[PDB]
């Protein structure tokens, strides 16, 4: 019952149980019908929290693995755990990504929905990239670039420069440039122009998303200052 599955999802969220939360919204999406946008947001929160817990564990242990340059035994132990954490992290990304390919992107009927799910697809391939090594990696990076790019094209054409979603896409796509493709200048100019373009049209801000747009603009500018360091 999509409305039960959704009500439990918010219960899961208040209890800080994001894997339960993510399981509810997963099965909602699987009912094959277009997600509402309170629904869409519930799915995005769940999986961002579920995947983010693994990303953060990965980074801690990956770091231990590098600070233990043999120390072979400690380094072997760290490697093994890293790879165990990776495989949780890949299952999570593949889960999301198959939801995107199978239901959410095909059912997206409005432009804002397509930019949102294509960004999300850019995001989950980027999390796979953070963690890919070798043969896998170029393919994975290409897919992330391609989703962001498509999203970026639609959002430039359809949305106001201060729209939270267009701003967030520019934020994440610029992060992809800097962090995954090691191209800081491209990252800086993508973020600079998204910032400047939103300053040029502050009249387009609305009461109900004012807050998010404003926060993302600040995050754009903070990365820039970090990247120019």
């Amino acid at each position: 019952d999509k409305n039960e599955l959704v009500q439990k999802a918010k219960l899961a969220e208040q209890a800080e149980r994001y894997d339960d939360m993510a399981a509810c919204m997963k099965s909602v999406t699987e009912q094959g019908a277009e997600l509402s946008n309170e629904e869409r947001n519930l799915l995005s929160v769940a999986y961002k929290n579920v995947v983010g817990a693994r990303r953060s564990s990965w980074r801690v242990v990956s770091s231990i693995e590098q600070k233990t340059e043999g120390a072979e035994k400690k380094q072997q132990m760290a490697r093994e755990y890293r790879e165990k954490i990776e495989t949780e992290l890949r299952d999570i990304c593949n889960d999301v990504l198959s939801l995107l390919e199978k239901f959410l992107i095909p059912n997206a009927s409005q432009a804002e929905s397509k930019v949102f799910y294509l960004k999300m697809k850019g995001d989950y391939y980027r999390y796979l990239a953070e963690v890919a090594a070798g043969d896998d990696k170029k393919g994975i990076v290409d897919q992330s670039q391609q989703a962001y790019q498509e999203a970026f094209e639609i959002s430039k054409k359809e949305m106001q420069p201060t729209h939270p979603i267009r701003l967030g896409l520019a934020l994440n796509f610029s992060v992809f440039y800097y962090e995954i493709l090691n191209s800081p200048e491209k990252a800086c100019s993508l973020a600079k122009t998204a910032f400047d373009e939103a300053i040029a049209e502050l009249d387009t801000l609305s009461e109900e998303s004012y807050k998010d747009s404003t926060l993302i603009m600040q995050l754009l500018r903070d990365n820039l200052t970090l990247w120019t360091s």
Binding site: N41, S44, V45, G168, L171, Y178, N223
Partner: peptide, 9 residues
């Protein structure tokens, strides 16, 4: 570490 888009939310 660069900052990406947070939850609204």
């Amino acid at each position: 570490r660069s900052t990406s888009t947070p939850n609204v939310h």
